[PDB]
């Protein structure tokens, strides 16, 4: 329904050297898929019975300046990738 | 070299299920070691405003634990580190979701062929959060509980008791269960022999 | 031994993955006789002619479809259909393919420095991001257009601003700002050019 957008911020300063540093970024975005997105449906023509179910699933994608992403469906586990993404 | 506080790993957002444990964690470097303090929505954090919180800061590793979070706990969380050279703030969000689940039929309707004049009992078992709204239907028309067609609820077990079945009662019966995050449907066929 | 229509012991589950990595839909199935099994994308039947490299398997009641290297274009709904003489069963889940992105970061920060009138001075940063961040230099709040006067130049991911010869008028607060579609960052430092003594 409504995508959520979470932001993280960092603000550091050094008065001994007069140096500062800022940062703000789209840290975590949480989205909502429509139930039609993951459904199940079964027909038994021998016993004349049918079953149907559908449900929303919320996806979670996270990121960071330190080059590392995180993603998954909320309820299932998250997966962690190493940006500049390679292969094994 | 006195070294102003700095983050090698700042706070990062956290999403988590109502009732679970949420955890903010960050690594801080500096010298002399900073005085760290945590905030929520601008107000300082304490056992008083967040019952059961746990805090720790050893070996460059800062960590704040909230035991049994509740929706009301959502908001911006800050960590501040200072010392003679300077300071540092790292800010992140905590969003808590309701633990929800689409309607599920643990026991589904079942087709049955019976004898005219029989008592027939069709029953399902349904779970959901939020509680599903459950209704019964015959051939697309919603059934209205009554003495001849008795619908009753017992825990998460729903029942339709047809006192006296006849051939006019034959057809496709179905039960629909809906809630804010989904819906499920179980249909079966009832044959009444004359 | 017991003619039983096909039923998903465990439905398909939607998945989010990183463009370039492997994706797998998995399901467990029952029935007898054992169901014929087949897969679809957005209603269209799946074959090695529609999805080169796909690995499909179906044995021991467990059906698997794996895409070794997913692309953005693979996003869609995936259906596993199981058929047999007593009935039929379907399961649909989504595949969501996300691209690599990372907000600007300063792997090496601007650094305050004191120098002597007439020194060559180099202010340099090392910036990382995906997509590649746009980077700018500023002095006392105003942006610097690279020029003879202040030569800005990039060398790999390392950006630097050379002051051919430094003078007091050059003392001031410098800063670099890095932005892209997912975040921004700023590193500020100070430069002090010593006077005559």
UniProtKB/Swiss-Prot annotation, chain A:
Principal localization reads cytoplasm
Q: Give its localization.
A: Cytoplasm, Myofibril, Sarcomere
* Annotated coiled-coil segments of the chain: none
Alphabetic keyword roster: Cardiomyopathy, Cytoplasm, Disease variant, Limb-girdle muscular dystrophy, Phosphoprotein
Which terms does the record give in the GO molecular function aspect?
Answer: BMP binding; FATZ binding; molecular adaptor activity; protein-macromolecule adaptor activity; structural constituent of muscle; titin binding; titin Z domain binding; transmembrane transporter binding
UniProt key word Phosphoprotein: yes
User: What tissues contain this protein?
Assistant: Heart and skeletal muscle.
Would I find Plastid among this entry's keywords?
no
Q: List modified residues, type Phosphoserine.
A: 39
What's one GO BP annotation on this UniProt entry?
A: detection of muscle stretch
Q: Which GO terms describe its cellular component?
A: cytosol; I band; titin-telethonin complex; Z disc
Task: Quote additional remarks.
Answer: The C-terminal domain appears to be unstructured in solution. It may promote the assembly of higher-order TTN complexes.
Record: disease: Cardiomyopathy, familial hypertrophic, 25: A hereditary heart disorder characterized by ventricular hypertrophy, which is usually asymmetric and often involves the interventricular septum. The symptoms include dyspnea, syncope, collapse, palpitations, and chest pain. They can be readily provoked by exercise. The disorder has inter- and intrafamilial variability ranging from benign to malignant forms with high risk of cardiac failure and sudden cardiac death. Muscular dystrophy, limb-girdle, autosomal recessive 7: An autosomal recessive degenerative myopathy characterized by proximal and distal muscle weakness and atrophy in the limbs, dystrophic changes on muscle biopsy, and absence of telethonin. Cardiac muscle is involved in a subset of patients.
Q: What interactions and quaternary structure are annotated?
A: Interacts with MYOZ1, MYOZ2 and MYOZ3. Interacts with CSRP3. Interacts directly with the N-terminal Ig-like domains of 2 titin (TTN) molecules. Interacts with ANKRD2; the interaction is direct.
Could you tell me what this protein does? Answer: Muscle assembly regulating factor. Mediates the antiparallel assembly of titin (TTN) molecules at the sarcomeric Z-disk.
What is the protein name for this chain?
Telethonin
This chain's source organism reads Homo sapiens (Human)
| Complete-protein stretch covered | 1 to 88 of 167
Swiss-Prot record, chain B:
Q: Where in the cell is it found?
A: Cytoplasm; Nucleus
* Tissue expression pattern: Isoforms 3, 7 and 8 are expressed in cardiac muscle. Isoform 4 is expressed in vertebrate skeletal muscle. Isoform 6 is expressed in skeletal muscle (at protein level).
Q: Which residues form the Ig-like domain?
A: 5-95, 103-191
Q: The organism sits in which domain of life?
A: Eukaryota
Describe PTMs of this protein: Autophosphorylated.
**What other comment is given for this protein?**
In some isoforms, after the PEVK repeat region there is a long PEVK duplicated region. On account of this region, it has been very difficult to sequence the whole protein. The length of this region (ranging from 183 to 2174 residues), may be a key elastic element of titin.
Subunit: Interacts with MYOM1, MYOM2, tropomyosin and myosin. Interacts with actin, primarily via the PEVK domains and with MYPN. Interacts with FHL2, NEB, CRYAB, LMNA/lamin-A and LMNB/lamin-B. Interacts with TCAP/telethonin and/or ANK1 isoform Mu17/ank1.5, via the first two N-terminal immunoglobulin domains. Interacts with TRIM63 and TRIM55, through several domains including immunoglobulin domains 141 and 142. Interacts with ANKRD1, ANKRD2 and ANKRD23, via the region between immunoglobulin domains 77 and 78 and interacts with CAPN3, via immunoglobulin domain 79.
Role, per record: Key component in the assembly and functioning of vertebrate striated muscles. By providing connections at the level of individual microfilaments, it contributes to the fine balance of forces between the two halves of the sarcomere. The size and extensibility of the cross-links are the main determinants of sarcomere extensibility properties of muscle. In non-muscle cells, seems to play a role in chromosome condensation and chromosome segregation during mitosis. Might link the lamina network to chromatin or nuclear actin, or both during interphase.
Q: Any domain commentary?
A: ZIS1 and ZIS5 regions contain multiple SPXR consensus sites for ERK- and CDK-like protein kinases as well as multiple SP motifs. ZIS1 could adopt a closed conformation which would block the TCAP-binding site.
| Clinical condition linked | Myopathy, myofibrillar, 9, with early respiratory failure: An autosomal dominant myopathy characterized by adulthood onset of weakness in proximal, distal, axial and respiratory muscles. Pelvic girdle weakness, foot drop and neck weakness are the main symptoms at onset, but ultimately the weakness usually involves the proximal compartment of both upper and lower limbs. Additional features include variable degrees of Achilles tendon contractures, spinal rigidity and muscle hypertrophy. Respiratory involvement often leads to requirement for non-invasive ventilation support.
Q: Could you say which protein family the record assigns here?
A: Belongs to the protein kinase superfamily. CAMK Ser/Thr protein kinase family.
> In its UniProt entry, what is this protein called?
Titin
């Amino acid at each position: 329904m409504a995508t959520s957008e979470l932001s993280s911020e960092v603000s550091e300063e050094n008065s001994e050297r007069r140096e500062a540093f800022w940062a703000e970024w789209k840290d975590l975005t949480l989205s909502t898929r429509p139930e039609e997105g993951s459904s199940l449906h079964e027909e038994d023509t021998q016993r004349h019975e049918t079953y149907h179910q559908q449900g929303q699933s919320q996806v979670l994608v996270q990121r960071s300046p330190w080059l590392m992403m995180r993603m998954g469906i909320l309820g299932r586990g998250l997966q962690e990738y190493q940006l500049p993404y390679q292969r094994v | 070299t006195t070294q102003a506080p700095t983050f090698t790993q700042p706070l990062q957002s956290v999403v988590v299920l109502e009732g679970s444990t949420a955890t903010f964690e960050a690594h801080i470097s500096g010298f002399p070691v900073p005085e760290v303090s945590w905030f929520r929505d601008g107000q300082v954090i304490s056992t008083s405003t967040l019952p059961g919180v746990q805090i720790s800061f050893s070996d460059g590793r800062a960590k704040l634990t909230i035991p049994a979070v509740t929706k009301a706990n959502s908001g911006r969380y800050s960590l501040k580190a200072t010392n003679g050279s300077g300071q540092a703030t790292s800010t992140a969000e905590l969003l808590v979701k309701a633990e929800t689940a689409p309607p599920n039929f643990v026991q589904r309707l079942q087709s049955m062929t019976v004898r005219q004049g029989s008592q027939v009992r069709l029953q399902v078992r349904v779970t959901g959060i939020p509680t599903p709204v459950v209704k019964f239907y015959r051939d697309g028309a919603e059934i209205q509980s009554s003495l001849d067609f008795q619908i009753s609820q017992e825990g998460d077990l729903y029942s339709l008791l047809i006192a006296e079945a006849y051939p006019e009662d034959s057809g496709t019966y179905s039960v629909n269960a809906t809630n804010s995050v989904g819906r499920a449907t179980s249909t079966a066929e009832l044959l009444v022999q004359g």
